[PDB]
């Protein structure tokens, strides 16, 4: 669990990268749950329901993002709230990782997981979702529109490879 | 690499710099490390020959006054419409 | 005919007093738009960017930073 994260340092990280200080070890800093669009023409009840998903997959009222660009040729402009986001940092940010690494394993229908090359050169997975693996308390009876989340697990790593070794615990790459 | 020159006095009026260019003379300065700035007047026809196959960037033993400091043409200043050199900078090399 | 006969009866902007000159308490020192020049000591800024003295003294234009400047007024005895 969380204490296993302490044993993960000297597990391989303390010996693989050969860091001369315990403070120079990777760590998970935060996670984001950016949902999507919820087209703000007929989706005043879509985001009202999608907000219930991220609020159900994690215990926190996510802040609704307001589109800040006046994109013409589209139903968007300065204003018009068309997005939702929720941040998880503390011990709760560790639960939402174990509950995914231990519940989103078989309920993915994908052999290689989500991707093998997801390190953006800055230590951030930003994986996908199918709305069924995550939200295990959100059964397949409540809503209809199945959407794909976006979990960007920003870590304190300093290189693409270190995120691979650091994310080895409870990961299928 | 043998070009002997003359020292010109201070505060050259506008006319008498125009009188010596009418001859085969060209103003010039000598700066670098090893000797301070000097207002010098070298000759035209002797400068072209000395620079003829010494190269665009070669060493010229310029005898300033009574000394002889090896120098190099730093930059030149040209009149394309009259085909004349009007001023030359000599960089003293150590 | 044309489309181009217009203009405005514009403004006598600029410096109204000089550096080293003596001025009274409500004198206008500089008439601008924006701040080409900025208020220093004992001068204030009006509602349309006017710079005016606040005390009897002598005017001084000085440098403020890289490429700014201010005015001032001192209180010579």
């Amino acid at each position: 669990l969380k204490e296993k994260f302490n044993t993960e340092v000297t597990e391989n990280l303390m010996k693989k990268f050969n860091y001369s200080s315990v403070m120079e070890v990777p760590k998970i800093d935060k996670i984001v749950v950016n949902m999507g669009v919820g087209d703000a023409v007929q989706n005043s009840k879509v985001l009202d329901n999608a907000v219930e998903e991220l609020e159900l997959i994690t215990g926190q009222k996510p802040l609704v993002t307001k589109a800040k660009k006046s994109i013409a040729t589209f139903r968007l402009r300065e204003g018009m709230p068309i997005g939702a986001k929720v941040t998880l940092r503390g011990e709760r940010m560790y639960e939402f990782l174990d509950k995914l690494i231990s519940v989103s394993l078989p309920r993915v229908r994908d052999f290689q997981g989500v991707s093998k090359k997801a390190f953006d050169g800055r230590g951030n997975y930003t994986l996908g979702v199918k709305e069924q693996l995550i939200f295990p308390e959100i059964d397949y009876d409540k809503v209809s529109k199945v959407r794909g989340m976006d979990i960007v697990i920003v870590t304190t790593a300093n290189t693409d490879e270190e995120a691979r070794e650091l994310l080895a615990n409870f990961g299928m790459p | 690499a043998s070009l002997k020159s003359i020292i010109r006095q201070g505060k050259q009026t506008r006319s008498d710099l125009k009188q010596l260019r009418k001859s085969g003379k060209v103003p010039a300065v000598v700066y670098g490390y090893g000797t301070k700035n000097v207002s010098v007047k070298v000759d035209e026809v002797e400068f072209i020959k000395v620079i003829r196959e010494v190269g665009r960037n070669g060493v010229i033993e310029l005898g300033v006054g009574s000394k002889t400091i090896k120098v190099m043409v730093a930059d030149y200043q040209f009149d394309p419409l009259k085909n004349q050199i009007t001023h030359i900078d000599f960089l003293a090399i150590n | 005919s044309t489309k181009n006969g217009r203009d405005s009866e514009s403004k006598r902007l600029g410096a109204k007093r000089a550096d080293g000159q003596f001025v009274t308490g409500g004198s206008i020192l500089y008439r601008q738009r924006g701040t080409k020049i900025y208020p220093g000591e004992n001068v204030g800024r009006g509602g349309d960017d006017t710079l005016f003295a606040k005390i009897d003294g002598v005017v001084k234009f000085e440098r403020k930073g890289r490429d700014k400047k201010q005015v001032s007024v001192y209180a010579v005895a």
């Binding site: 800093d29 230590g123 870590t155 304190t156 | - | -």
Partner: protein, 118 residues
């Protein structure tokens, strides 16, 4: 990820407050500075730039074990008396770049009852 320095973020919140800084030698400014276990008062005259009276938390007279907020109130009492001996009675308080809360309302409420006017 990148970390933000908490000193530079307040050293810029302070230059913007000292655009009404006036230690005029008849009404100087009372400075403050927090490190982590260290409240540092000071009183300066800005027309000349010289310190008139300094009292910190690391001095031997204020070397004790307290909450650092019950201890900060003993740092405003110290400098409040040294300011009394210098014939100064009215100051203008700049909060550094910090919020006036906790440590500093204690350092100011402790200095504002010791006679210093502000």
């Amino acid at each position: 990820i990148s970390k933000i320095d908490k000193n530079k973020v307040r050293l810029k919140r302070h230059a913007r407050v000292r655009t009404n800084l006036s230690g005029t030698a008849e009404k100087p400014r009372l400075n403050v500075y927090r490190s982590n276990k260290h409240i540092y008062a000071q009183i300066i005259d800005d027309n000349k730039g010289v310190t008139l009276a300094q009292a910190s938390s690391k001095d031997s007279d204020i070397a004790t074990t307290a909450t650092k907020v019950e201890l900060a109130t003993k740092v405003g009492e110290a400098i409040a008396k040294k300011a009394a001996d210098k014939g100064i009675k009215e100051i203008v308080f700049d909060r550094g770049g910090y919020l006036y809360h906790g440590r500093v309302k204690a350092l100011a409420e402790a200095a504002r009852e010791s006679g210093l006017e502000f």
